[PDB]
């Protein structure tokens, strides 16, 4: 991935590692630490630091929120891959490795989610007037995005997808619920924590919604090869359209999350 996004991801990884110190009882902290880093990286979390910087705040004030977002995503990822016993859900062709048993995984996801809210609540800076109101607003955004009408609705509907038989419209909706709302949440929170006005917040939100949906589609294009460029182009267009009005070094980068800049690498390979 691009250098900028990779350096932001590493910062989040270093912050989570400093925040989760394996200690007694290791039966609790060992899996808590392992499952946090076993989940895939999500751009919903880097998008939070990026959006903050895009509106001029310091990415450091969006860190607790970027961490919380990854944590909520990770707990959902762990629960999504639990071996359930009743065939109530498809056993998605891709079985992943499991270091810990179902019970420990189940419980650990339950411990990881509140940890994100703990980090957010504890990051309130006394010498910062608007911290409480912003952190409160961001807790609401994240809890909604990881709630019954957000990511969980996506996970639930994803279970209805049937290989090479589900329409692109249906898969795109699942992606919007499972990934777009969370990405929209990260961009919006990063804007909020960086002082943006309601104007820039709503545009960055829409941006994350479209980029997150597209990101989910790209990852589902590996199990429903029919990924038409129409959809990709539609979302990409919808996304870029929301970024008009940010200009500059920072906005250039943000923009690249959705549209990779022209690079000799690409061309050379095709060569």
């Amino acid at each position: 991935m691009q250098p900028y996004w990779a350096a932001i991801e590493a910062d989040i990884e270093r912050y989570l590692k400093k925040s989760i110190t394996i200690r007694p009882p290791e039966t609790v902290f060992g899996p808590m630490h392992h499952l946090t880093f076993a989940a895939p990286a999500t751009a919903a979390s880097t998008l939070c630091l990026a959006a903050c910087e895009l509106v001029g705040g310091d990415r450091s004030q969006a860190m607790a929120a970027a961490a919380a977002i990854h944590l909520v995503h990770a707990a959902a990822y762990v629960h999504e891959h639990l071996p359930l016993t009743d065939g109530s859900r498809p056993v998605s062709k891709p079985a992943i490795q499991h270091k810990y048993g179902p019970n420990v995984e189940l419980l650990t996801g339950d411990g990881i989610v509140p940890f994100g809210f703990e980090l957010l609540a504890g990051s309130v800076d006394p010498a910062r007037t608007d911290d409480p109101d912003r952190i409160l607003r961001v807790i609401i955004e994240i809890s909604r995005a990881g709630g019954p009408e957000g990511m969980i609705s996506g996970l639930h509907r994803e279970e209805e997808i049937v290989d090479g038989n589900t329409s692109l419209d249906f898969i795109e909706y699942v992606c919007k619920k499972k990934y777009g709302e969370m990405h929209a949440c990260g961009a919006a929170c990063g804007a909020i924590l960086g002082g943006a006005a309601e104007e820039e917040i709503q545009k960055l939100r829409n941006f994350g919604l479209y980029q997150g949906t597209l990101r989910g589609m790209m990852e589902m294009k590996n199990s429903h090869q029919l990924i038409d460029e129409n959809i990709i182009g539609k979302l990409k267009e919808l996304a870029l359209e929301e970024l008009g009005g940010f200009h500059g070094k920072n906005a250039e980068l943000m923009s690249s999350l959705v549209a990779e800049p022209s690079l000799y690498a690409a061309h050379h390979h095709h060569h």
Binding site: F29, H79, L82, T108, G111, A121, S143, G146, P148
Partner: protein, 277 residues
């Protein structure tokens, strides 16, 4: 005189009403149906009562504490939903009715449970009125600490990971009960004391009070769940003696407050001791 049974029924009625209102049926219907199936099955509502009473005790009102009271019941509810799953306790019935995954499938039960956990935070954060933001945020933090890796989940994890043991002593048993039972009761009392505007010393007394009835919501409970335990490590001889000392220390913390204001908790504690379920 204080009518504790009448007090409890009245709080439970207000809580049930607020819970039904907070979690309505909407799409995806089976996720919400599942949440409501376990959340609205009634019961004593001890955690919501602890929260409301702690808030009223320090001078605040019920309406301020209600979202937080519903949140702790939402957490309590999903922790049982997850505890009943095949990979955990594998129970087919609860309250005499089919367990959530038996009615909706395991996939819905896991997600409806996660939905209740997330919604607990959403609801306290968005619906709480009568308390400034810094205070609502402090409460969200306390809720998080009481149910996570240093609270409810830690108890559960240490408990399932300590099944194949035999060297289990008072320290191990205290860690489990304090975490899987006391931590959420402590959190319930604290959210209320803080939301009610309590001073730090009041919060501190109530935090200790909750820890004591927490452990008690057990020691007696063995002599309520059995008839690894305490009577196994000391026998009903000094078992029923431990609960009597725990109740006393609980009630001692309540001496900080005027006795008339303290009656609901003094009684929520004599029940919590002398209860058969």
């Amino acid at each position: 005189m204080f009518d504790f049974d009448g007090y409890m029924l009245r709080k439970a009625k207000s809580v049930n009403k607020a819970l039904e209102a907070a979690v309505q049926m909407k799409e995806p219907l089976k996720i919400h149906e599942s949440m409501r199936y376990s959340l609205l099955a009634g019961g004593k509502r001890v955690r919501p009562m602890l929260c409301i009473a702690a808030c009223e005790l320090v001078g605040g009102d019920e309406s301020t504490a209600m979202p937080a009271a519903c949140a702790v019941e939402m957490i309590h509810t999903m922790s049982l939903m997850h505890d009943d799953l095949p990979c955990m306790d594998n129970d087919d019935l609860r309250r005499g009715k089919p367990t959530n995954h038996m009615a909706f499938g395991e996939s819905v039960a896991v997600l409806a449970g996660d939905a209740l956990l997330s919604f607990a935070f959403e609801h306290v954060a968005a619906a709480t009125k009568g308390a400034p933001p810094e205070r609502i945020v402090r409460v969200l933090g306390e809720l998080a600490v009481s149910i996570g890796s240093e609270g409810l989940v830690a108890g559960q994890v240490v408990d399932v990971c300590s099944e194949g043991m035999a060297e289990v002593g008072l320290d191990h048993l205290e860690f489990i009960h304090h975490h899987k039972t006391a931590a959420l009761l402590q959190g319930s009392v604290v959210l209320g004391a803080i939301l009610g505007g309590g001073k730090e010393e009041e919060v501190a007394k109530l935090r200790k009070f909750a820890n004591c009835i927490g452990l008690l919501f057990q020691v007696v409970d063995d002599i309520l769940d059995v008839t690894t335990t305490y009577p196994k490590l000391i026998g009903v001889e000094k078992s029923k003696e431990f609960a009597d000392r725990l109740n006393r220390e609980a009630q001692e913390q309540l001496l900080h407050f005027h006795p008339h204001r303290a009656a609901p908790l003094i009684a929520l504690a004599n029940y919590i001791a002398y209860r058969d379920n």
